[PDB]
Amino acid sequence: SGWVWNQFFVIEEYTGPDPVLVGRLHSDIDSGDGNIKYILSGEGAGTIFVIDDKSGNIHATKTLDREERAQYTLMAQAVDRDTNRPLEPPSEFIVKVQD
């Protein structure tokens, strides 16, 4: 419908050594049995942004400076914990570092 909902943000001074919550990848088919696995990839994945593939929560790990980088494009995936076959179609989302 043209609404845009697939972005998170981190309000920056909150960033540093201590990990802060960015957001949660989540499919509506996740019954909570923990048999779906969330795969994060893209800009800053596995360094700046890290995910728990059971809970789907993304954290920021470093001090971030909006001047150096305004935002990051990451890719979401939801695959089955055992077949590893995609449930949801992979989709991009953006993380915006806040002023």
Add this chain to the structure above:
Amino acid sequence: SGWVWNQFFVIEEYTGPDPVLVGRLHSDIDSGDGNIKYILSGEGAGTIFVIDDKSGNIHATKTLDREERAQYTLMAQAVDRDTNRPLEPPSEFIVKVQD
């Protein structure tokens, strides 16, 4: 698809008498010329949660406690700034008060 992008969150220990950024409403028909007006409705709209109807930035105005309220369900709308004709269908979104 079944991806869920329409929930913001607020970390408890940042809420207070200082407004915290919650999220941005945004349509892709927004051309950044201020002709689209962002409207918020439902639980806490216009008290707890406040919008700038031009940028679409949402803010939390109060301390929040997930013990008292885990969750706020609200409604996002967009109208033409002077005709007030809706430009999008309403879209429900929820804000989660984070542990």
